[PDB]
Ligand binder design. Structure first.
Ligand code: ZN
Ligand code: ZN
Lengths: 142, 147, 226, 202, 209, 117, 101
């Protein structure tokens, strides 16, 4: 088929969501602007051919609020209106995902950088540029 | 490293880890990070000197304590993440001398190897002469002895 | 089992508007010679020569598998490069990449399915060695070639030329039940059960193994002990 | 043997090592390294065994078979050996090394679990930690094995607890379905038989 | 690809000849072990659109004790045979005075015709086999011991000797390849002779259910 | 062969998609969102290297010479500046199918030359 | 005829087998109870060996009965032991190895 799509299981949401929808809902209209948070060097094609099948999954949404509704439909408390799903999904993106990067009036660019770092960190292991983390490594314990 | 060895701003518990191949550089400040103290090694020589041992041997008069030894920039606290990006030596005599060269880029040394043991395993005499499932059974039966 | 992915080096698709136009510089196409979007694959010599394949066999497998919806054009086995080109005879070109993936994942160029890795060695143990009887009534352990696998089909295997259909055991009891029957399952179960006991060198009497294999098979079906 | 490890490593680094058929380069390198180390341990063990006197008290038990084995004497006197985890050597628990006292990408004997010291000579601390890591695996397997073997025991018994030899000398279950027509397909009990040799065969 | 199909049909015919000899139908030693060359010369080497096509190579045989009960086989041309392509065969059955036969299909049979084979079964006790199934005489394998079909007068003597009922025996299901090989209904017991490593030879009795 | 690179719409900054001009029979890249189109210069669209013979030397970074944990030899001097110290290490990569090749990186900073023997 | 039966029962020929009473040890006990001295010619007539083994094989019953279904099972149940017994209580083997009276 197409192969190797990227999704994002995020809390208080019943179903996984493709990451491009998450960056569109998070505040980024464009595609190059989304891609600048994930692939830090655009002259690497091997990143590009792996990142494009999840981009081609979601060229039907190009604006923020439709992606907000796409999240809020999947919500644990599914809103009945268009403007209740948006408030629920905006609450989730504001507070539920990634508290450690900031919960404030505007922390969307910083949360976007950390999420793009997570996607980049996934792509490096899927390409074998790095190695997988060990669960028993007691540096990773507290 | 210059600041943490002087305790200017960065307290000793904070860990700095530079990953080189992956360009990331992390700093951790949290609670729950397990760490142990190590000596510091410049070019091939210890930062610990005769004068430190002399000032600290006549403790209870000078009170040149462990904390003054930390403050001098002679020991560090190293946790597990920072222990991956570093090169240690077991014994400064046998491992920092001219020979068929192994590393010659050491960074730290250990104070004594017998500080890898615990409490109940630190009462076993000659434990490196036993088979290792015996040291476990003695580390269990040391909690059951009468005294 | 061998797919196209084992032998191919890389795959690149071009949109070449005329088949004679040849964006790739290959004179073999020019002497060799309707849709413009084409697929090109480079194989490698090593896996091709290890398994002894020819591009005629491969193109035959494509034309058998997909029919005459599409035509392969293959290099003769003389040049350093191992190229073949693919068109589609007359949902535009994502279909081409889709059938690329479907063609890569499974074609069975050689081999049979579910058997992924097969080994070869000469057996040292006398039971695994072939045993005959000579003219003077000796036993004369023979050291012939055997070959062990990593998957199992056992009925597509036995139904082949030059494979011994008397001696091939298959380590898998449900399959022996499907193929050889319940009385073969009792003997095979006994052998696979005695093997793990005698691997330590310990001994257990035939009484107990025989009774376990009997109670486990005395109803015509596999009575698993659960 | 330790020099023969290093020359194999040099043949591996300079791409001078051809893979064994049926194996990858990694597994054939591992096979050759473990071959040198096991042959070393065996030769040192045999030298130790040749060294012992008639009046020895380790030999007094091993020859009698009362306690110990021929590998224990070698492992007390000569060489402990290589410590293994899941059949392989000591794995790279750190980033491409084992302990922070070793250079990265060190496939040597001392860096991966081989103990060139005996129990009489004591262990170096690296070797001590590796031997603890070796003993831990068997100490785990002891505790893990019991809760499977007892369950297999009980589950085997519940299928066959009513199977007995009747006065027909046949073998039948609780509902008199016949399992064997003679017990052990000979009628004979297991505690009165022996090993013998068929003379007329071969 | 005609040498492989010729070799395949030769092994099919050879296994059917061993099938009919083991079952009891009278077949000669000439057909029992012929080489590939008698097959190739006597059917014609070209299975693709040529002389050794199906249906006019199909075997009919007769039982040894009387030449009244007769056993066809039929090798259909279709990969997946159907009801309309077996009622032809059943018409050949009712055309003759014969009772039963084999059908060696090429691919898997359709379920509706399998239910058909179930339905006229007490009239005509016929059955099928598969092509992949029949490229090996599985009786020749070393795991498979010697199976013998018991006569009813011997079954009565068996049950009288050990003083036990017909359901107390060990049993065998009708669908496994050995009982399907000999071809036997339920309520019919089978000797199994096998070598014992403890005491010589051992006979047991499986009842078809 | 080479590797295909994604190019972007100038107008709305989205991924262009390949498409065939049937009339001129020419490959063109077109945006889904806006009508902007472009002529293809490469004519290669999807390339997939399955044997995946990869050059690790593109991925190696010169800063790795600052790692204390890594070994170094003076047996192999630098190819560019002829400096003796070279820090060496293995592939350090998963799916490096069978490789114990040593990669050498030069010390003595701002050289950064990287080679394989 | 028994030798070929063993060769078909035991492919990959291994003489080691499990059987009730150790005949070699029992013969060697008989040699010490009765003071054999195997340097002298034997008193035992070799037809008595044959008709003693044939009678002993009658005495060793597993399946009782006389109908031919029981006799086949008695023959099969004692098959390997009777092969071993006829193979070690020969007339040649008693007359030239064990020298029993
Ligand atoms: Zn656009
Ligand atoms: Zn340089």
């Amino acid at each position: 088929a197409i192969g190797q799509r990227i999704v994002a299981t995020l809390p208080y949401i019943k179903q996984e969501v493709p990451i491009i929808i998450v960056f569109r809902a998070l505040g980024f209209v464009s595609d190059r602007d989304i891609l600048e948070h994930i692939i830090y060097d655009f002259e690497d094609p091997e990143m590009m051919e792996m990142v494009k099948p999840s981009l081609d999954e979601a060229f039907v949404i190009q604006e923020q609020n439709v992606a907000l509704n796409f999240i809020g439909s999947r919500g644990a408390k599914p809103g009945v209106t268009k403007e209740k799903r948006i408030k629920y999904a905006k609450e989730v993106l504001q507070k539920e995902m990634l508290p450690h990067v900031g919960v404030s009036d505007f922390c969307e660019t910083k949360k976007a950088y950390f999420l793009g770092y997570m996607v980049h960190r996934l792509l490096l292991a899927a390409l074998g540029r790095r190695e997988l983390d060990d669960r028993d490594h007691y540096g990773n314990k507290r | 490293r210059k600041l943490r060895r002087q305790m200017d701003i960065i307290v000793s518990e904070v860990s700095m880890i530079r990953d080189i191949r992956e360009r990331e550089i992390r700093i951790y400040t949290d609670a729950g990070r397990i760490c142990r103290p190590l000596l510091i090694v410049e070019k091939q020589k210890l930062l610990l000197k005769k004068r430190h041992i002399d000032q600290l041997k006549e403790r209870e008069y000078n009170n040149y304590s462990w904390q003054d030894l930390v403050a001098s920039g002679v020991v560090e606290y190293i946790d597990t993440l920072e222990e991956e990006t570093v090169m240690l030596a077991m014994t400064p005599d046998d491992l920092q001398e001219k020979e068929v060269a192994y590393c010659s880029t050491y960074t730290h040394c250990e104070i004594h190897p017998s500080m890898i043991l615990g409490v109940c395993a630190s009462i076993i005499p000659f434990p490196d002469h036993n088979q290792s499932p015996r040291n476990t059974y003695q580390s269990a039966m040391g909690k059951q002895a009468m005294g | 089992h061998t797919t196209l992915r084992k032998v191919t080096a890389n795959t690149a698709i071009y949109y070449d508007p005329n088949p004679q136009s040849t964006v790739v510089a290959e004179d073999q196409e020019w002497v060799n010679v309707i849709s413009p979007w084409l697929l090109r694959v480079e194989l490698d010599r090593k896996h091709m020569t290890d398994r002894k394949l020819t591009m005629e066999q491969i193109a035959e497998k494509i034309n058998a598998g997909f029919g005459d919806d599409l035509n392969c054009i293959f290099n003769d086995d003389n040049a350093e490069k191992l190229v073949l080109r693919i068109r589609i005879m007359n949902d535009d070109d994502v279909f081409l990449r889709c059938i690329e993936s479907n063609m890569l994942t499974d074609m069975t160029l050689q081999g049979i399915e579910q058997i992924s890795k097969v080994y070869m060695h000469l057996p040292q143990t006398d039971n695994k060695k072939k045993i005959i009887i000579t003219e003077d009534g000796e036993f004369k352990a023979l050291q012939e070639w055997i070959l062990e696998t990593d998957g199992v089909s056992l009925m597509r295997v036995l139904s082949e030329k030059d494979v011994d259909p008397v001696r091939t055991t298959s380590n898998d009891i449900v399959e022996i039940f499907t193929v050889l029957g319940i009385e073969a399952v009792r003997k095979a179960l006994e052998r696979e059960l005695y093997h793990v006991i005698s691997f330590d060198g310990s001994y257990v009497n035939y009484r107990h193994l025989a009774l376990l294999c009997d109670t486990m098979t005395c109803r015509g079906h596999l009575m698993a002990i659960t | 043997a330790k020099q023969d490890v290093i020359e194999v490593i040099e043949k591996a680094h300079n791409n001078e090592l051809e893979p064994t058929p049926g194996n990858t380069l990694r597994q054939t390198f591992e096979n050759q390294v473990n071959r040198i180390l096991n042959d070393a341990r065996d030769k040192t063990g045999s030298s130790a065994q040749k060294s012992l006197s008639e009046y020895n008290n380790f030999k007094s038990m091993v020859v009698s078979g009362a306690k110990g084995s021929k590998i224990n004497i070698s492992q007390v006197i000569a060489v402990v050996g290589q410590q293994n985890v899941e059949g392989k050597r000591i794995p790279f628990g750190f980033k491409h090394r084992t302990l922070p006292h070793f250079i990265k990408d060190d496939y040597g004997p001392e860096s991966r679990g081989f103990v060139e010291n005996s129990y009489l000579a004591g262990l170096t601390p690296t070797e001590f930690f590796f031997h603890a890591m070796g003993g831990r695996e068997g100490l785990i397997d002891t505790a893990v094995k019991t809760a499977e073997t007892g369950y297999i025991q009980r589950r085997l018994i519940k299928s066959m607890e009513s199977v007995m030899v009747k006065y027909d000398a046949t073998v039948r279950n609780s509902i008199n379905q016949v399992v064997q027509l003679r017990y052990g397909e000979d009628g004979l009990a297991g505690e009165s038989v022996e090993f013998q040799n068929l003379a007329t065969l071969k | 690809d005609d040498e492989e199909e010729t070799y395949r049909l030769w092994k099919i015919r050879k296994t059917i000849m061993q099938l009919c000899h083991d079952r009891g139908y009278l077949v000669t030693q000439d057909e029992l072990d012929q080489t590939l060359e008698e097959f190739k010369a006597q059917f014609g080497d070209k299975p693709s659109e040529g002389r050794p096509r199906r249906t006019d190579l199909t075997v009919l045989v007769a039982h040894n004790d009387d030449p009244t009960d007769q056993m066809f086989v039929f090798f259909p041309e279709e990969p997946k045979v159907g009801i309309k392509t077996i009622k032809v065969y059943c018409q050949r059955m009712q055309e003759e005075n014969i009772t039963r036969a084999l059908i060696v299909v090429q691919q898997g049979m359709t379920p509706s015709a399998k239910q058909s084979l179930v339905d006229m079964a007490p009239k005509y006790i016929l059955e099928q086999f598969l092509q992949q199934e029949l490229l090996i005489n599985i009786t020749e394998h070393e795991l498979v011991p010697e199976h013998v079909v018991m006569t009813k007068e011997e079954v009565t003597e068996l049950l009288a000797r050990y003083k036990l009922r017909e359901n107390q025996l060990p049993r065998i299901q009708a669908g496994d390849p050995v009982a399907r090989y000999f071809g036997i209904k339920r309520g019919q017991v089978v000797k199994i002779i096998r070598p014992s490593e403890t005491a010589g030879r051992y006979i047991t009795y499986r009842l078809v259910q | 062969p080479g590797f295909v690179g994604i190019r972007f719409c100038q107008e709305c900054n989205n991924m262009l998609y390949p498409k065939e001009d049937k009339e001129n029979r020419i490959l063109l890249y077109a945006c889904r969102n806006c009508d902007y189109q472009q002529e293809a210069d490469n004519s290669c669209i999807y390339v997939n290297k399955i044997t995946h013979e990869v050059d690790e030397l593109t991925q190696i970074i010169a800063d790795v010479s600052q790692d204390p944990t890594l070994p170094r030899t003076e047996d192999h001097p630098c190819q560019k500046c002829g400096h003796k110290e070279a820090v060496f290490f293995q592939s350090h990569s998963a799916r490096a199918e069978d490789a114990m090749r040593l990669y050498y990186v030069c010390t003595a900073p701002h050289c950064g030359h990287r080679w394989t023997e | 005829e028994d030798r070929e039966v063993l060769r078909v029962i035991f492919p990959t020929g291994d003489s080691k087998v499990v059987l009730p009473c150790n005949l070699l040890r029992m013969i060697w006990n008989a040699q010490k109870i009765f003071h054999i001295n195997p340097r002298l010619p034997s008193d035992l007539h070799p037809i008595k060996v044959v008709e003693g083994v044939k009678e002993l094989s009658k005495k060793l019953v597993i399946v009782n009965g006389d109908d031919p279904l029981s006799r086949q099972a008695q023959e099969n149940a004692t098959l390997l032991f009777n092969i071993h017994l006829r193979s070690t209580l020969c007339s040649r083997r008693m007359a030239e190895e064990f020298r029993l009276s």
